[PDB]
Amino acid sequence: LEPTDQDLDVLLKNLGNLVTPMALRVAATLRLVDHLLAGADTLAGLADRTDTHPQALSRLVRHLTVVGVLEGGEKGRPLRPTRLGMLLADGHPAQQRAWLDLNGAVSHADLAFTGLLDVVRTGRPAYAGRYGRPFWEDLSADVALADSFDALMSCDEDLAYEAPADAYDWSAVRHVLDVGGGNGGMLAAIALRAPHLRGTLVELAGPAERARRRFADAGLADRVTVAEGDFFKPLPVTADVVLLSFVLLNWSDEDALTILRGCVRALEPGGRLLVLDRADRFFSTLLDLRMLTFMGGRVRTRDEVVDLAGSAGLALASERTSGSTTLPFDFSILEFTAVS
């Protein structure tokens, strides 16, 4: 097979092109598109507004112009965003400015892709090697990263947990242990549907503080408590339901297995462990590699999660997938009992 001239062009400009995506990141971070729409239309205007090196900005703008993000500045026209480039305006619903924003979590973590060689060699995440602590520990301690990460997730939205909370009968459940519950979305939606239910959420310090507030706002502090803990350590209480809501997919087979054994150990006799989790080919492989490189996890099919659960000492007892309007993906509750 013989590479065409069009093949080499696509590899240089697109697939092998590391330079342009960093230019787009820098344009988002500097709010370049917003500053042009706000009246700026000369390189030195823009440089003035962004506290950047005029000459170096010119050179970044040159490149953004070639690649179709900006137009103008004919060297006499006014510098301006293209149709494409308006994706980096602040209010655009696709939020691409925030995705690419280097202050934000996703773009900041994307930089770790420079260590992808190591990630393919060892199967370990690159995030720590670049920033000094692993991804969730980093987010826990730095609120701007955690809130920028959350804002981009559809799970952050108001009614995001209503559907999964509706797909499961909570009426006889006494105590939910919500392992890695984040800011408490699922548990709050559970507690509201089941007034006698008690909850314990286990989190790092960052999300724990945000859950304390969600549970107070919701009139739930009396029966839903927040404990700072490490779900690699033994869990601080037992429960007739243990809940892992969008947690497993962040962890390697190895890690996800030590978490699950930790949950089984906390599971009261006869109790249930619930895992809530879950052109087109491109976006899943993109997410998959981010998941791998950011934190060492992966999107795991139903069967995979079931054998994984199997080696932690759990048998499947029911599955149930469904859609919501609000979630761009379908969700899925797997329900396990202890085999012993």
Ligand X SMILES: Nc1ncnc2c1ncn2[C@@H]1O[C@H](CSCC[C@H](N)C(=O)O)[C@@H](O)[C@H]1O
Strands 267-277 and 314-322, how do they pair? unpaired
Give whichever of 100 and 202 is closer to ligand X, judged by the CB atom.
Answer: 202
Q: Answer for the pair 215, 224: CB distance below 8 angstroms, yes or no.
A: yes
Quick check: 148 binds ligand X (CB under 6 A)? no
Q: Binding residues for ligand X, how many (CB under 6 A)?
A: 20
Least separation in angstroms between CB 98 and ligand X: 18
Quick check: 140 binds ligand X (CB under 6 A)? yes
Burial state string for 84-100 with b = 16 or more CB within 10 A and e = fewer than 16? ebebbeeeeeeebbbbb
Give whichever of 81 and 181 is closer to ligand X, judged by the CB atom.
Answer: 181
AA letter at 279:
A
- Site residues (CB under 6 A) for ligand X, limited to 201-260: 202-204, 207, 229-232, 245-247, 250
Q: Answer for the pair 43, 61: CB distance below 8 angstroms, yes or no.
A: yes
185 is in an annotated binding site: no
List, as one string, the DSSP characters of 33-65: HHHHHTT--SHHHHHHHHT--HHHHHHHHHHHH
Q: Which stretch binds ligand X (CB under 6 A): 50-58, 108-116, 121-129, 197-205?
A: 197-205
Least separation in angstroms between CB 202 and ligand X: 6
Element (H, E) at 165: helix 162-166
Least separation in angstroms between CB 336 and ligand X: 17
- Site residues (CB under 6 A) for ligand X, limited to 150-169: 155
319 is in an annotated binding site: no
φ/ψ (deg, to 5) at 281: -60, -45
Q: Answer for the pair 69, 24: CB distance below 8 angstroms, yes or no.
A: yes
Least separation in angstroms between CB 180 and ligand X: 3
Q: Answer for the pair 177, 266: CB distance below 8 angstroms, yes or no.
A: yes
Half-sphere exposure of 196 (CA within 13 A, CB side): 5
Quick check: 128 binds ligand X (CB under 6 A)? no
Residue nearest to ligand X (CB): 182
Quick check: 127 binds ligand X (CB under 6 A)? no
Quick check: 185 binds ligand X (CB under 6 A)? yes
Backbone dihedral region of 58: left (phi > 0), alpha (psi from -120 to 50 degrees) or beta?
Answer: alpha
Least separation in angstroms between CB 157 and ligand X: 11
Who's near 329: CB < 8 A, 6+ residues apart? 154, 278
AA letter at 178:
D
Q: How many CB atoms lie within 10 A of CB 75?
A: 7
Give whichever of 250 and 337 is closer to ligand X, judged by the CB atom.
Answer: 250
Q: Considering only residues 23, 186, 188, 334, which one is a binding residue for ligand X as defined by CB under 6 A? A: 186
Least separation in angstroms between CB 167 and ligand X: 14
Give whichever of 71 and 142 is closer to ligand X, judged by the CB atom.
Answer: 142
Residues tagged in the binding site annotation for S-adenosyl-L-methionine: 161, 180, 203, 230-231, 245
Residues tagged in the binding site annotation: 161, 180, 203, 230-231, 245
By the criterion CB under 6 A, which residues form the site for ligand X?
136, 140, 155, 180-182, 185-186, 202-204, 207, 229-232, 245-247, 250
